[PDB]
Amino acid sequence: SMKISPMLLSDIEQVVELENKTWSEQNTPVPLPVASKDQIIQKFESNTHFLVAKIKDKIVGVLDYSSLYPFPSGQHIVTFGIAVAEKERRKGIGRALVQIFLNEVKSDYQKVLIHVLSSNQEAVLFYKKLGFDLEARLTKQFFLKGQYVDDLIYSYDLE
Ligand SMILES: CC(C)(COP(=O)(O)OP(=O)(O)OC[C@H]1O[C@@H](n2cnc3c(N)ncnc32)[C@H](O)[C@H]1OP(=O)(O)O)[C@@H](O)C(=O)NCCC(=O)NCCS
């Protein structure tokens, strides 16, 4: 059975491995690899929070979130990343992560906002399905694999 829980310091090896199997030029414009033990600790030590999903105390999903801006005028906007293990997808894990996340931040923020590469077909469908709004589209933001990719900006009304 599947459980969601706070990420442990001792879980970081696994989160690194999972993320680095997950990120491709299809879903991020940053150079690869994006994850490392020390990058993840840096984040952990600067207030980014991590939800993790396990199946037999094996990590199969991860969601990190944090304030979008470090200054007060923008402090009411939260952002997040999420990665589900390829073999474990389409089983409700993403949904369940997003759902507890939303209930964490409900109280403390007004608005969720994320950036999605237009090449990220499953993310596009995922976010629409979970009720996010397509707020903006930035045209030809990135060149990846000989294609011009757009940046789709999705938001969520915490209210
Ligand atoms: C996007 C992602 C997190 C969704 O993970 P998930 O656990 O497989 O999603 P869920 O099982 O919770 O599904 C909720 C839903 O997502 C949709 N969706 C997710 N993947 C889809 C796909 N490959 N094709 C069509 N619809 C899809 C649904 O249609 C939906 O409802 P349903 O499953 O009852 O049909 C997963 O694909 C992911 O890991 N992508 C890898 C890289 C990434 O993270 N992209 C951007 C996030 S920063």
Say which CATH number the domain at 81 has.
Answer: 3.40.630.30
The C-alpha atoms of residue 24 and residue 94 are separated, in whole angstroms, by 18
- Measured from the Cβ of residue 101, the count of other Cβ atoms closer than 10 Å reads 20
DSSP code of residue 123: H
Contact yes or no for 83/22 (Cβ under 8 A): yes
Q: How far apart are the first and last CA of the chain?
A: 33
Q: How many A from CA of 72 to the centre of ligand 1?
A: 33
Taken in order 2, 126, 43, 87, the sign of the CA dihedral is positive
Binding-site residue positions: 82, 84, 90, 92, 94-95, 120, 122, 129
90 within ligand 1 shell (Cβ under 6 A): yes
Ligand 1 and 138: CB distance under 6 A: no
For 6-58, the three-class secondary structure string (H helix, E strand, C coil) is: ECCHHHHHHHHHHHHHHCCCCCCCCCCCCCCHHHHHHHHCCCCEEEEEEECCC
27: phi then psi, degrees, rounded to nearest 5? -125, -5
**Pairwise CA distance, residues 122 & 24, whole Å:** 13
141 within 8 A of 151, measured Cβ to Cβ:
yes
Maximum alpha-carbon separation in the chain: 43
Q: What is the CA radius of gyration of the chain?
A: 15
Binding-site positions for CoA: 82, 84, 90, 92, 94-95, 120, 122, 129
Q: Is 41 in the pocket of ligand 1 (CB under 6 A)?
A: no
Structural method:
X-ray
Residue that has been written with the tokens 């599947």 in this structure: 2
CB under 8 Å to 55, separation ≥6 — which residues?
1, 2, 88
Number of domains making up the chain: 1
Q: What does the buried/exposed string (b/e) look like for 106-131 if buried means 16 or more CB atoms within 10 Å of the residue's CB? A: eeebebbbbbbbbbbeebbebbeeee
Range of 41's domain? Answer: 1-159
Name which residue sits closest to atom 24 of ligand 1, judged by CA: 122
From residue 100, give the alpha-carbon distance in Å to each of 33, 59, 94, 104, 147: 28, 17, 10, 6, 35
